[PDB]
Amino acid sequence: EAILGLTPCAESAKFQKVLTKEVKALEKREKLYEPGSAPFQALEATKAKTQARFAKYAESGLLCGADGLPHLISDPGLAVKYGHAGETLIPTIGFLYVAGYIGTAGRTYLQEISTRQKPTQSEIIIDVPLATSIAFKSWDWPNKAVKELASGTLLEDAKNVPVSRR
Amino acid sequence: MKYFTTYLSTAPVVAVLWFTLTASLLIEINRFFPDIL
Amino acid sequence: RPTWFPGAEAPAWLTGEFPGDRGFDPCGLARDPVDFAKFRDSEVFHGRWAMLGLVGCLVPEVFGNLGIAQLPAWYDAATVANTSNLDYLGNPNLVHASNVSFIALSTLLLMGPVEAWRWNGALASEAKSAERTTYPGGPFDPLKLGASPELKLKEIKNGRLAMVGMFGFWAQSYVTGEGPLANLAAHLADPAHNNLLNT
Amino acid sequence: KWYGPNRPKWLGPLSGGAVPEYLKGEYAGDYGFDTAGLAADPKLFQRYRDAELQNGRWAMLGVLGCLAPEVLSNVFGVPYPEPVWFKTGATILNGGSIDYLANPKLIHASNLLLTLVLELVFFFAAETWREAGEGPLGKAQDKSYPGGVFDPLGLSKDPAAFAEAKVKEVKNGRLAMLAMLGLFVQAGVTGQSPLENLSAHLANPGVNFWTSYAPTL
Amino acid sequence: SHSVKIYNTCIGCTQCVRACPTDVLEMVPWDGCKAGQIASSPRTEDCVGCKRCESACPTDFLSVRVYLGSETSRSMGLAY
Amino acid sequence: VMQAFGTPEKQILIEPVFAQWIQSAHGKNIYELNILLSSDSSNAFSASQAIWLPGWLNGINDKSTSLFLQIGP
Amino acid sequence: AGPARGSTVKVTRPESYWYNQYGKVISVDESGAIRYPVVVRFEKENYQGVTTNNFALDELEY
Ligand code: CLA
Ligand SMILES: CC1=C(C#C/C(C)=C/C=C/C(C)=C/C=C/C=C(C)/C=C/C=C(C)/C=C/[C@@]23O[C@]2(C)C[C@@H](O)CC3(C)C)C(C)(C)C[C@H](O)C1
Ligand SMILES: CC1=C(C#C/C(C)=C/C=C/C(C)=C/C=C/C=C(C)/C=C/C=C(C)/C=C/[C@@]23O[C@]2(C)C[C@@H](O)CC3(C)C)C(C)(C)C[C@H](O)C1
Ligand code: SF4
Ligand code: SF4
């Protein structure tokens, strides 16, 4: 469905122009080699991939501009109403899960070693068992996050936080 | 080997190893499932 | 004590000193006794605006049917003022207002002082005390009668009814697409097949 | 059905060595079943207890909500567009609306993302109050068993009846969880409604089984 | 000239005095600390402003403090 | 790197939809969004004593003027 | 009163690196002439690279 003045890539002539332009370049390169030789095969693999890629973009409801290149929709309302949520909105959730995981693993390891005798030695020599255990137990990180938040164990109190003369 | 694993546990070795695996994984995904936009 | 539900036990903070108490506060919004006095004013205030708003919304339909004037419908007046002129009681020489933004500005400019004065407890720029007014008297009570707890309960009760009524008017107008008395007429005609649950 | 050291157990009469030590019959639904040792840490055991009750109660409302609009369409003539549970949802897609009791003057909802966002926001509030154990609706008596507004009939006032009813709740919960897991797998395998699945096994006890689908794998 | 001031947090370690390259500071007797000596700055006309003393001082926010001011040929470190 | 490897179709080209919405509300009809001044039926458009609007809309939908330039990635 | 040797204090001197932080008491001086009698040791070194400092009683919370 054409929105925001954009055409769907599946029914855009400029899209086809682009595909033609890439495939023609590859043909020109192929002229130099012999139809059985291994460079030839490489250029054929390249061309195959190329045509496949354009076909994929065509059956994905991507939206082309005047340049004939696909454009992404980032307002979540527009994305969900017109079937474009896979462009930005799903990746959002995907990034925020993995970033929360990495944070949780890092915070966890740091809070664990902080109770050791020399905690700074465990920062330059990683406790690898401890780190692997933390990395694999941290797949359900919102458990820990919402617990820490609602309980109050997420934030240090202001009285315990070093601060300047203000 | 008696302290070789502790050497492998040091930060730049663990970093090189972890990035190498993480990079390798992303390369292999981008071999199998290319051109995700 | 009379309560909103058979046998239902009242909160601790709802004791029965104030008119309209039926021990109704599931969401615990009047735990803080400082907020409870504000809410009490807000309840009566919302009530009085709902009563005036209900009467003022029935008036176009009634005045239409009794052959007094062809007033716009309550959900049409802003459209009328926006596209054409709003002439009082039909009469094109009365008021004859044409611009919705000047109506809105006027509404803020007239209701600003009045609202501040109400809150401040006097015609002054600073509140007299930490207490809400809600029952002024003086010029606002010309017939010299009132502020009895029975009458207060009568106000509260009619208010609450009108606020539920006003919610009705909004939803009705959206759904049925016609005026409120028309909706009553429709239900009074054939009640089994002119209602919400029949489609 | 009971508590204590001589309660019903999960291997019945043959349940001598089948009980771990940390399950001493203090909490509802202790049949001494924990073969993977998940509850050996007692903080983890408190967590899991809350989780088993959250999954259970949600599973109960779920199974009732997956069956009820199909039943209403079957028994009564309520004209739901796609009344099956795994087909509901798609009704709000395209240009279609969601009308409660198939009446287009009831919710008439057409904006999927507005629906979802309202749900997440409401839940972010209510779940944060749940986890804290204090909120607008009051302070909880126990994290899993709040009481107050949540118990308006006062059925938790009697101690012994409360102790029994905890065992009723956890056992209905477990059943409902197995029901819901049933619904999911049935839809995944048979592709038909779960009332049609029941009708098919009521009509014919025989071949109409999981062992009509098993040969195809 | 620069101005060098000594505050009462001094612990009389003598490190600033040792550090100074133009003999501005000396240790005089005092009773405010266990070492029974404080630093002092009599010859501030000879201070070049290097702040070596403040680098030497071990108290938390220094007890010796150099406030740079007006330049002279002495403070500007000129051999011409 | 997409341009360098000869694959301009794999660029990330996010549309500025929030600025295009604002432009649509001001009266630009190039984004087919039909709101406020770009809808004929709105209160904002049909405000009787508007009267600056014909001039304004002529201006905002003329490529020569720089009155709200068209925008993209 | 003084803190006990070995006890934990919180610094309340605003110009200090260790403000709002906790240290161990190592020594208290008993003379009244001394202006900063309490010696405190911290785990985190300051910008100078030292880990110890003298304090008065009115700069500690014990
Ligand atoms: C446990 C690791 C961890 C966590 C949970 C955080 C969390 C945060 N950082 Mg910090 N930070 C970290 C490490 C961490 N950081 C490191 C290692 C550096 C040095 C490069 C920084 C440098 C830094 C700066 C300059 C800023 C932040 C800021 C922030 C805050 C906002 C988010 C952000 O800006 O991310 C950005 C994160 C980075 C730029 C650093 C990348 C962190 C890596 C990818 C993850 C940790 C790596 C670690 C080695 C994992 C080992 C775990 C294993 C042994 C189990 C957030 C509180 C910002 C802030 O103050 O917000 C108010 C801010 O300006 N961080
Ligand atoms: C108390 C409580 C709770 C509650 C509650 C509930 C149910 C609250 C509900 C409140 C509700 C339902 C409040 C309505 C207001 C209506 C008003 C003010 C209308 C004015 C309307 C006016 C002034 C209209 C004016 C005009 O129409 C006129 C006259 C002519 C038209 O041409 C023009 C316009 C339209 C401008 C909880 C949350 C359940 C639990 C908690 O623990 C305790
Ligand atoms: C105890 C134990 C063990 C165990 C175990 C076991 C057997 C665990 C099993 C857990 C299981 C099976 C848990 C399912 C929950 C399902 C839920 C929450 C369903 C909700 C459903 C809801 C809320 C929603 C339903 C709907 O949205 C749907 C779907 C579609 C919509 O159209 C309609 C509605 C909105 C109504 C081990 C591991 C074996 C050994 C160890 O040692 C000890
Ligand atoms: S600044 Fe340099 S010259 Fe001056 S007192 Fe300090 S050490 Fe001595
Ligand atoms: S000023 Fe600092 S460096 Fe100089 S003696 Fe005193 S404590 Fe030691």
PDB file of C-alpha atoms in Angstrom, chain A residues 1 3 60-63 73 76-87, chain D residues 93-94:
ATOM      1  CA  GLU A   1       0.000   0.000   0.000  1.00  0.00           C
ATOM      2  CA  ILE A   3       1.823   5.711   1.772  1.00  0.00           C
ATOM      3  CA  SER A  60       8.466  -7.917   1.701  1.00  0.00           C
ATOM      4  CA  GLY A  61       6.185  -4.915   1.222  1.00  0.00           C
ATOM      5  CA  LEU A  62       9.204  -2.593   1.263  1.00  0.00           C
ATOM      6  CA  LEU A  63       8.483   0.932   0.008  1.00  0.00           C
ATOM      7  CA  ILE A  73       8.969   3.553   8.492  1.00  0.00           C
ATOM      8  CA  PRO A  76       5.275   2.575  15.328  1.00  0.00           C
ATOM      9  CA  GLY A  77       1.672   3.455  14.544  1.00  0.00           C
ATOM     10  CA  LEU A  78       2.317   3.776  10.827  1.00  0.00           C
ATOM     11  CA  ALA A  79       4.507   0.698  10.915  1.00  0.00           C
ATOM     12  CA  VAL A  80       1.898  -1.519  12.514  1.00  0.00           C
ATOM     13  CA  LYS A  81      -1.047  -0.162  10.496  1.00  0.00           C
ATOM     14  CA  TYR A  82       0.633  -0.766   7.160  1.00  0.00           C
ATOM     15  CA  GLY A  83       2.703  -3.868   7.894  1.00  0.00           C
ATOM     16  CA  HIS A  84       6.205  -2.393   8.223  1.00  0.00           C
ATOM     17  CA  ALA A  85       6.969  -3.391  11.824  1.00  0.00           C
ATOM     18  CA  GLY A  86       9.883  -5.602  10.743  1.00  0.00           C
ATOM     19  CA  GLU A  87      11.861  -2.566   9.574  1.00  0.00           C
TER      20      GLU A  87
ATOM     21  CA  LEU D  93      -5.921  -6.692  11.308  1.00  0.00           C
ATOM     22  CA  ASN D  94      -6.678  -5.378   7.805  1.00  0.00           C
TER      23      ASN D  94
END
